[PDB]
Symmetry: none
Subunit: 77 residues, 10 copies
Amino acid sequence: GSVQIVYKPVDLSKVTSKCGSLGNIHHKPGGGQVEVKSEKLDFKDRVQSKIGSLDNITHVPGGGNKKIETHKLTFRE
Amino acid sequence: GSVQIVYKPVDLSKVTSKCGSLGNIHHKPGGGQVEVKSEKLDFKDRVQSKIGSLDNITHVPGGGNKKIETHKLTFRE
Amino acid sequence: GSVQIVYKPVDLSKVTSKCGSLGNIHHKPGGGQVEVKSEKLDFKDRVQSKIGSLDNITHVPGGGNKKIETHKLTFRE
Amino acid sequence: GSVQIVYKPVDLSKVTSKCGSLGNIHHKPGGGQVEVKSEKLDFKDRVQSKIGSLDNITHVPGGGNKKIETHKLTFRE
Amino acid sequence: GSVQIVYKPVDLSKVTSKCGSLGNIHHKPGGGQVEVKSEKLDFKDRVQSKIGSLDNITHVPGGGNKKIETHKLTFRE
Amino acid sequence: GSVQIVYKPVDLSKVTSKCGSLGNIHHKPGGGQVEVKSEKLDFKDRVQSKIGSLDNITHVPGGGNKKIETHKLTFRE
Amino acid sequence: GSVQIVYKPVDLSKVTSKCGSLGNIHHKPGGGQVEVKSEKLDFKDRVQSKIGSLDNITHVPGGGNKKIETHKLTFRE
Amino acid sequence: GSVQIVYKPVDLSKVTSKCGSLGNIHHKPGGGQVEVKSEKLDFKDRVQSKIGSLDNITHVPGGGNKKIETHKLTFRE
Amino acid sequence: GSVQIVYKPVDLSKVTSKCGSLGNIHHKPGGGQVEVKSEKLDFKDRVQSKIGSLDNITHVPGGGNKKIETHKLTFRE
Amino acid sequence: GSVQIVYKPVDLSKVTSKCGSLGNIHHKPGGGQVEVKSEKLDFKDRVQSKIGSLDNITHVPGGGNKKIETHKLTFRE
C-alpha cells in the first residue's frame, strides 16, 4: 500500500495596527516590601522560578502585534 | 510500499504597525525592599531561576511586532 | 520500499513597522534595597540563575521587530 | 529501499523598520543597595549565574530588528 | 539501498532599518552599593559567572540589526 | 496698703522607669504615595505647616520620661 | 504702699531611667513617592514649613528623659 | 513706695539614665522619590523652610537626656 | 521710691548618663531621587531654607546630654 | 528714687557622660540623585540656604554633651 501526504497550508494573514498618536504615559510606583524565607530549594527539570521580586515594567510598543504559527507533521510506521 | 511526503506551506503574512507619534512616557519607581533567606539551593537541569530582585524596565519599541513560526516534520520507520 | 521527502516551505513574511517620532522618555528609578542570604549553591546543568539584583533597563528601539523561525526535519530508520 | 530527502526552504522575509526621529531619552537611576551572603558555590555545567548586581542599561538602537532562523536535519539509520 | 540528501536552503532576507535622526540621549546613573560575601567558589565547566557588579552601559547603535542563522546536518549510519 | 507675695513651691517628684530588656523591634513600612496640589500659600504668623509627607519614625528610648513644669507669677498694679 | 515679692521654688525632681539591654532594632522602610505642586509661597513670620518630604528616623537613645522647666515673673506698675 | 523683688529658685534636678548595653540597630531605607514644583517663593521673616527632602537619620545617643530651663524676670514701671 | 532687684538662682542639676557598651549600628540607605522646580526665590530676613536634599546622618554620641539654660532680666523705667 | 539691681546666678551643673565602649558603627549610603531647577535667587538678609545637596554625616563623639547658657540684663530709663 502506498501512502501520499500533501501538506500545503496557505497563509495571507495581516496582523496590523494603526495609531495616530501614543503618548502621555506615567508609571509611578510607590515602593513596597517583599520578604521571603526558605531553607531547601531543589529545582531539577525545566524550571522557570522567580522568588523575592519587586519589578516595574513600562512596556509601550508602537505595535506589539504578535503572530505565533506552529506546524507539526508526525508520520509513524 | 512507497511513502511520499510533500510539505509545502506558503506564508505571506504581514505583521506590521504604524504610529504617528510615540512619546511622553514617564516611568518613576519609588524604591522598595526585598529580603530573601535560603540555605540550600540545588538546581540541576535547565533552570531559569531569579532570586532577590528589584528591577525596573522601560521598554518602548517603535515596533515590537513578533512572529514565531515553528516547523516540525518527524518521520519514523 | 522507497521513501521520498520533499520539504519546501516558502516564506514571504514582512514584519515591519513605521514610527513618525519616538521621543520624550524619562526613566527615573528611586533606588531600593535587596538583601539575600544563602549557604549552599549547587548549580550543575544549563542553569541561568540571577541572585541579588537591582537593575534598571531603558530599552528604546526604533524597530524591535523580531522573527524567530525554526525548521526541524527528523528522519529515523 | 532508496531514501531521498529534498530540503529546500525558500525565505524572502524582510524584518525592517523606519523611524523619523528617535530622541530625548533620559535614564536617571537613583542608586540602591544590594547585600548578598553565601558560603558554598558549586557551579559545574553550563552555568550563567549573576550574583550581587546593580546594573543600569540604556539601549537605544535605531533598528534593533532581530531574525533568528535555525535549520536542523537529522538523518538516522 | 542508496541514500541521497539534498540540502539547498535559499535565503534572501533583508534585516534593515532607517533612522532620520538618533540623538539627545542622557544616561545619568546615581551610584549605588554592592556588598558580596562568599567563602568557597568552585566553577568547573563552561561557567560565565559575574559577582559583585555595578555596571552602566549606554549602547546606541545606529543600526543594531542582528541575524543569527544556524545550519545543522547530522548523518548517522 | 502693703502687698506681700510668697511663692514657695516645693517639688520632690521622681518620674523614673526600669526595664530589664528592650529589644526585637522591627519597623518595616511598605512605601506609599502622596500627591498634593496647591496654588497659593500665605503663612504669616507662627505657622508649623507640613505638606506632602511620607515619614517613618522608629523611636525607641530606654527611658522617655518627660517632665514639663511651668511657673507663672503675674503681678499687676 | 510697699510691695514685697518672694519667689523661691525648690526643685529636687529626678527624671531617671534604667535599661538592662536595648537592642535588636530593625528599621526597614520600603521607599515611596511624594509629588507636590505649588505656584506662590509667601511665608512672612516665624514659619516652620516642610514641603515635599520623605524622611526616615531611627532614634534610639539609651536615655531620652526630658525636663522642661520654665519660670516667668512679670511685675507691672 | 518701695518695691522689693527676691528671685531665688533652687534646682537640684538629676536627669540621668543607665543602659547596660545599646546595640544591634539596623536602619535600612529603600529609596524613594520626591518631586516638588513651585514658581514664586518669598520668605521674609524667621523662616525655617525645608523643600524637596529625602533624609535618613540614625540617632543613637548613649544618653540623650535633655534639660531646658528658662528664667524670665520682667520689671516694668 | 526705691527699687531693689535680687536675682539669685542656684543650679546644681546633673544631666548625666551611663552606657556599658554602645555598638553594632548599621545605617544602610538605598538611594532615592529628588526633583525640585522653582523660578523665583526671594529670602530677605533670618531664613534657614533647605531645598533639594538627600541626606544621611548617623549620629552616635556616647553622651548626647543637652542643657539649655536661658536667663533674662528686663528692667524698664 | 534709687534703683538697685543685684544679678547673682550660681551654677554648679555637671553635664557628664560615661561610656565603657563605643564601636562597630557602619554608615553605608547607597547613592541617590538630586535635581534642582531655579531661575532667580535673591537672598538679602541673614540667610542660611542650602540647595541641591547629597550629604552623608557619621558623627560619633565619645561625649557630645552640650551646655548653652545665655544671660541677658536689659536696663532702660
